[PDB]
Amino acid sequence: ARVTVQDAVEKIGNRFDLVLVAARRARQMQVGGKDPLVPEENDKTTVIALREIEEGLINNQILDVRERQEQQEQ
Amino acid sequence: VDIVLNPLGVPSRMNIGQILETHLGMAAKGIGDKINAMLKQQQEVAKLREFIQRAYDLGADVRQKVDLSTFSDEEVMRLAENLRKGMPIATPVFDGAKEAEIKELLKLGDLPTSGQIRLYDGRTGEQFERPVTVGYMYMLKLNHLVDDKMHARSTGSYSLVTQQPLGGKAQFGGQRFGEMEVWALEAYGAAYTLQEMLTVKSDDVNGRTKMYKNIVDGNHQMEPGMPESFNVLLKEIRSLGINIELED
Amino acid sequence: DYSGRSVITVGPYLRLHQCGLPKKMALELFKPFIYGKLELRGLATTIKAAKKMVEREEAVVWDILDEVIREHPVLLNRAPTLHRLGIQAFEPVLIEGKAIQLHPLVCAAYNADFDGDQMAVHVPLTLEAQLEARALMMSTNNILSPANGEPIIVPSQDVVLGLYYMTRDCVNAKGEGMVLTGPKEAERLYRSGLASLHARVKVRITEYEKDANGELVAKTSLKDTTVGRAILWMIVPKGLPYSIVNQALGKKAISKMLNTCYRILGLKPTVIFADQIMYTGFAYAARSGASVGIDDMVIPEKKHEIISEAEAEVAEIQEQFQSGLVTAGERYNKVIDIWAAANDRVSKAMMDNLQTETVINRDGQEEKQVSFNSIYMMADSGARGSAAQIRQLAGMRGLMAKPDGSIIETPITANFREGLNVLQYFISTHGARKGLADTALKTANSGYLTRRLVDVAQDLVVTEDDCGTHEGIMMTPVIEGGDVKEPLRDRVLGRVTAEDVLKPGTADILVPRNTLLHEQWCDLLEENSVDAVKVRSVVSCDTDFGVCAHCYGRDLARGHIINKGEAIGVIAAQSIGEPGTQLTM
Amino acid sequence: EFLKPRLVDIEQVSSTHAKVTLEPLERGFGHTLGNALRRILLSSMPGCAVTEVEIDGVLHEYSTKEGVQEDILEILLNLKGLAVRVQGKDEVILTLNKSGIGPVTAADITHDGDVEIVKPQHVICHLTDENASISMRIKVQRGRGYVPASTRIHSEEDERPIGRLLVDACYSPVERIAYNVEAARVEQRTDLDKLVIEMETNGTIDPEEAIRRAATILAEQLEAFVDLRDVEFDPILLRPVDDLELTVRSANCLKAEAIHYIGDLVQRTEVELLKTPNLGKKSLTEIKDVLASRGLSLGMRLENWPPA
Amino acid sequence: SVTEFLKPRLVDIEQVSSTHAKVTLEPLERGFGHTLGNALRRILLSSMPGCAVTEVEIDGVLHEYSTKEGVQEDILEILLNLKGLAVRVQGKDEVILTLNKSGIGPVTAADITHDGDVEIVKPQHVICHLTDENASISMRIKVQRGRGYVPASTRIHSEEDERPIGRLLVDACYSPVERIAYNVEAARVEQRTDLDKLVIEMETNGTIDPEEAIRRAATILAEQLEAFVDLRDVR
Amino acid sequence: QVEYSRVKIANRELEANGKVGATYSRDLLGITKASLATESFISAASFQETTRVLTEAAVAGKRDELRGLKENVIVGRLIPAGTGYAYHQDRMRRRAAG
Amino acid sequence: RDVHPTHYGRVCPIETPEGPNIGLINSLSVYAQTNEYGFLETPYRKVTDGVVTDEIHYLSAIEEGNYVIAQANSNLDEEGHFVEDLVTCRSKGESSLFSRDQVDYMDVSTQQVVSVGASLIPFLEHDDANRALMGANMQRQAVPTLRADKPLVGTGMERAVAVDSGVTAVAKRGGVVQYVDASRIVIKVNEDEMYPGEAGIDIYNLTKYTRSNQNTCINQMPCVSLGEPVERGDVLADGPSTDLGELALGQNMRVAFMPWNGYNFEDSILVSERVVQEDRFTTIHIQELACVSRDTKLGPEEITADIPNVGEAALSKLDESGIVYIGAEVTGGDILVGKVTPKGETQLTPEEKLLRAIFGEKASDVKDSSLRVPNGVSGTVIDVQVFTRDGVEKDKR
RNA sequence: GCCGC
Ligand SMILES: [Mg+2]
Ligand SMILES: [Zn+2]
């Protein structure tokens, strides 16, 4: 449970961009075609994405490179 | 005790009538408790009449001249049986009881003259460090209840014009998100919340159904559109001699 | 749609990010979510079956509702939204009843009181909206007000009284000169009943300092303090000095210590500290048992003498006027001045009697310490009330008149503890009526002004990183005759210098150009003798269609610099127009 | 090592007032025991109280009876304060029938087998007219705490006739309790305390029995602390797939495509299922046609899948 | 129905370090959390058998205020140190120990003489970092078992000030409970919602792990009521 | 508008004919008169007298271009501030490139 | 909307609405009355020499501007003289001290400047003016409770407000009480006062539970027991929020002034469960629902028990005439009145023919439009007041 | 319009 999102803010510091990053990660983990990279503790996808950002393994650039890799795979 | 109030509300609001009425009610209920206890033990009528006469002659030269000497014994019995729950004293508007009279009324009923007693915490059993002002205050019940003030809505009926949800209870209306709330949302920077407020929740006729279908399926996607109110405004302005259009 | 409304009450057990949501108000806002969770789990196949089952409100429906509310934030707003803190996002908690339980610490931001107010509840039903409500509008996110930079979530009233009564000292009490090995022993001694909250003792206390670069170092010693302060020391986070506890904490030390905790440690230790402060303040305020009686308002003994002297003086000046050497205006002004002086002297005598009333003996002879009078405690601690209200309660009520702006000659010599005559009450009704009518008729002007400001500043956004201009404006402390209003620190904090700052020693550069000033830089400047600093402003940004992030200083709500895309015009308009409802015209 | 308190000098001031004394106590145990006993006694003590009343000619609480001075609401309020004792039963029925002039009390309640009225002067009604009759049936139940008449919904499982009047139930015989701690007379010991508990009830429960019940409740609660340790639902689904009466041609295809239950059938979309070998456009529509007869459209999305 | 009361199930213990524990018990019927927690806290904090140092004797100056010969740490701090040391004496009501040291280095509690009956849980506990530079300190303490916390308001032992100077009147902390605090929260079971959840946060100086102390306090409290629950027992 | 002047002068000064650039005298207006002079007719018509603002806009045949916060709110788009700032930055580069 | 020095004994300076209408709506003082021309007046006591007289003069705003008016709370001796030489007076819209001989009039009493609403506030002189204003304005929003409870600390105006309002039932030729009941009081008027012929008795029919304008309850209950002599003007029954002829619109609560763990933070109130158990602050609310059978071109609208396409469970609480039984408890969306609206069809197609063959003669063509309880509304059915037109068949009930 | 904030 991410009561405060300070660390996630400092990982990618705008307080506005991480909203979009977490939104796209939650879309990936909710609509389909993706699985969490952090242990799921019966939490909603929003805070799972926030925790992934806080842990330092989710950001816009790696999202783009993964999207390019999946596009090239098919 | 039955009611617990905050001492912090007395000095800023400047209500000393609160405290004075509390002390006076404590004194009156003390006299009533004395009468009730003396009636409980089946005490003779003479002592009870003596006590009531003593209580009715208090004060510093009051204008009431109630006397029990001419009262019939049955009348005395009935009156005493009417004062078990308290002695209903009366203070006129701009003249009445003073501090000395209230204090001697307290002293008559075997209560501390300061008006404050020692309270013990019902949870811990420990005694509160300072004395606490206890008494009786006449509390009313106003006509504002939550059985008439609790409302919630998710989907209902909308007007034919502007296709927005109705307003107020008994029509199952939605809360109005006025101009200042939108200013606050803009100042926060919450653009998606604002957009979902303006289009999906109010006027996007296709957007409402699409978003509901997405929610039931579990998609959480917006797919916004054009509010009906702007179309109504465009038709209104075009109904004059003025042309307004959405260019590409 | 997806909106609710009901009356708010107080929940003291809540966290800063939590609100109490009735389960009947829920299950209606979250109807489509419950339908989706029912159809997805297999409990109901068709939408009709799920709709009917929700209509019948079975137990598994409540279970699924509890499951679906888990991490969905909800936002509450109050009807007169004056600034952006009038709408905030919380995490709902299911309670049984019909009233919303609001956290007390956000009432000041909401301007909310529990005497019949209502709120509105909206559901942010989108992933983007959920993230925005969590990462932007959460009650833990906004702690400093975006108009002056001071903390807006601050303890008040009962919490302040508990903190103040906890951290006081009495000349003689249970336990004197005892040596305690730590704060835990002090708490054990108080709980067991072997000592008092205000007893003076010595306790070993371990401090922490952030002097090392991103590192915490330890420091332990024997400090002279009281039992209550030792008990309070168990709440403050590591890294703070002990000088912030060894005080009385009258609603102004607690705000300063919260601000220091924010500026030194961060955001989440600050919210934890605030919640713990509220808990301990409520607990010890309940433990104290403070109450108000009719003997708490003590009237000075010399008040009657001062009244008699003033009456004799006005009789003398009336005789002098009857002799014919004084015109109406001069005698009127002299009588007004004499009555004002008498009122001031009576108030001073009453305050002197009320200040150090307690005279408690000690181990040797007797002393005089600050009074433990309940009314004086609630006034000095700042929990509620001021000196003028106490003067009205115990001293003279004073001179007052507002039929047309003039002043009555004879004053009200009776307070509220004693009775007021018919004439005096009828006189005070003039001011009461004027004040209430003024209050009811200025809100329209405030709203119109706020509308005009918001519209004139709606389309202003930070759209650039740095304009690069060398322009700026001249900053000097505000002086006026023989008095100072604003020191340079308040006027220059969080601003970017347009030009280099020179010490009185020539050719000495203290801070370079295009730099952001903060607490350390302001303290360093105040250490030297700087008087004028050139800082850039928004009226010289020279950028087109927007404002640079450097010409506009740091945002007041968050310590860092302001980021691109922040609508600053609306914030400025709301910051200017939020007052005015309290401006006397 | 520790001295133990013993209940000595139990004394009864009046029918309601009573005193209980525990002579030997240690330094701090007196206040702990007193507060625990007071909380247990005021919170949870069993008793019997009136649950519902059924008067002869009335229909609702907001009516009036010709010949009686009070409204039915005040009759119910008076009956709420009736104090009774019942032995061996929890659903006794107290019938009352009286005609004449003057007030009616609990004395004229018909004498049941094992039912004791502690206070037989409780006035419940006043009769004013000579030829006026009153007759009610009072149900008395045994309970523990305060139960409002609106919270109980299980009573609506069986239809209740028009005329049954539901009253609130209090069930608590204990009304007031205080306690004090005094110095004991034992001089051989250094310093001992004594506990005196004063209680005011309605006369339903004995003081000693109340103390024993409170102590037993406390001990049963404390028993847990002495050893801590500890350190697809709809029946239409999950049916055999051979219940739809499909064609022979689709019978072979479903076996090849690993479809064996009704539930796994409904999780396949049209686009990919058509790619399965030899399904046929017209034959697939018959699968949808049959599944439409059960109301399960093709393409549903469940969460979990057990083997059965 | 009647006479049946809810019992806690699925107790959760959160062990912290080796002397700090948090115990959660649920569900509890309304108003029972406060009663149980308060009774347990009062018993644990006011009346628990234990052993603590109550006497000190430093060779040389014997006044409460001393020059301390320059031992880099005042004698009041020495008393504060030796107050907090935890000792588990086996089968002996009173025993007297002595510590002597020399050579530059901290003087811990382990430097005291080791007796078979005594068990110093905190022997690494430094009484003093020796005299400044190099010198010797010799001192003898005495320990005894008591109950609760007994402040050294007065001695009333031996005659005149012989026992005081032989003890210096160190406060006696017999009960091995540094801190206990309980919080009552709301918990729900099925349709019911007014049930209490009890959270007990407990720390101990040593010689006792917290849950055993809770068990002991519950044992004494429940066994105190055997004058009323013995005959009135289910079994 | 001041911004148009500063932009026009820079373009003129960049070219050889730098003397073409025109000097200007800045003006001061009230918050009520500076609101009704905005170049977006969709705004300044939702605030004060709308008959006068629409009449002047109809004759001049102007365009809104929806460059502020209030215009996007009315037509139900993302405001160009906050989380919607990035989205409005993308739309402008596509228009410039065609 | 400002209080004027002429508002002294005519209109109340305390009682007035808050936001919009402050100063525009006022309340008459207790002793104020209207002159023949339509101007406000207030009584004063004539003062001759140094003794105040008992004769009373009513002065208007113009006449009182010339005389010197003393204060109500100025001490007097046994003979009526002023006990002190210098007394406070109003001469011309001002306040100053005058001689014992220069005065002309005296105030009748100390309530002269307060209205009826503000007269019921004890210790009014110890309250701030605006907070007392709020209290007076809030005293009128109270809801009468289940059982009345007199105030322990009152003022003495409760009897006047209770009697003058008219909610009670006051004897007019009181003799002795003959027959008492929860709904009637019959008084045998004594012989001393009597209209000749036909003897005579007084019959009072108390109004039982009745819906008010604010959907509250109005109820009257007797105060006399039996054979109890009563005089003229005595109270027989006390209406809503009245105890033995005294205004009782609240309850006496035991109060402690102390902070309690933040549960009385700001203006909140902490309440014990014992207050809930004794049914204090429990009020009865009454609601009126009506249905009308109105004629149509296609045919008349009938009220009948049998409702097409309605199960037998729904008709359980309906009588043979389609009206709920008295005392039935209805919740949610239960049906109250069974009403059917006719439908028009003069072309008997074969499908409708076989529909009529399989089912009843109507075959449920007649639509149903029945009065159902609105959602969230529950309560016991008190009264049914069916009205019928002249000529139409009488309803069974 | 009346009332509540
Ligand atoms: Mg309020
Ligand atoms: Zn700039």
Numbering used by the authors:
A (entry chain E): 2 to 75
B (entry chain C): 1094 to 1341
C (entry chain D): 348 to 932
D (entry chain A): 7 to 237, 248 to 324
E (entry chain B): 4 to 238
F (entry chain D): 1279 to 1376
G (entry chain C): 548 to 944
How does the study describe this entry?
Using a combination of focused classification and electron density subtraction, we obtained several distinct structural states within the same dataset, including pre- and post-translocated RNA states, as well as σ-free states. We focused on the pre- and post-translocated states which were resolved to 2.8 and 3.4 Å resolution respectively based on gold standard Fourier Shell Correlation curves. We now refer to this β-hairpin (residues 104–112) as the RII-finger due to its functional similarity with the σ70 finger, also known as R3.2 in σ70. In RPitc-5nt, RII contacts the template strand at the −5 position, and threads around the template DNA–RNA hybrid and forms a sharp kink at P110 (Inset). The RII-finger is stabilized by hydrophobic interactions between P110 and Y112 of RII, and the conserved P251, V253, and P254 on the β′ lid and M330 on β′ switch 2 region (Inset). The template strand now interacts with the σ54 RII-finger.
In approximately 60% of bacteria, a major variant σ factor, σ54, forms a class of its own, lacking structural and sequence similarity to σ70. In σ54-mediated transcription initiation, σ54 recruits RNAP to genes responsible for regulating a variety of stress responses, including nutrient depletion, membrane stress, antibiotic exposure, and biofilm formation.
